[PDB]
Subunit: 88 residues, 2 copies
Amino acid sequence: DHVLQHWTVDISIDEHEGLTRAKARLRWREKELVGVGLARLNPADRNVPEIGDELSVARALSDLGKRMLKVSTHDIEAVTHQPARLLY
Amino acid sequence: DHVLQHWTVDISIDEHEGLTRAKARLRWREKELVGVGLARLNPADRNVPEIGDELSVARALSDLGKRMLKVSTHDIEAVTHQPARLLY
């Protein structure tokens, strides 16, 4: 009675000179998105690169989810033929 | 000069009787999070399950990113020994 699926987000993390850039790619059906996030270390945490990693990724995933809400909106509008906007 | 990493988010999608539930799991270093999202179809799009899929996943990824911002906050606070809060 349930229909189950499994998807994957691929995340790249690039640390360079205290700047960490994350890119989170998701492909599904007819769509593909990349969420992007940045985190820069400061003197107080410059020796804790794990913070830059997880913060840039948090941002990339949030960006990805935001972009996906927009795709969802476009698909709903295609069905209803009425403008829509999803806030959450 | 760059340090590169690659991480993966695992997403489950469960459709049942018009309700779609997505769970997005990320493990990294010393942490593990699951973001959760729901989408329920309505009569106007009940025959477009792809909308429930992508909307529940958008929500799960947004939830995951929000939870990860909180983990990042805790880690920053552990370094600075000062309360913090990351809005984005």
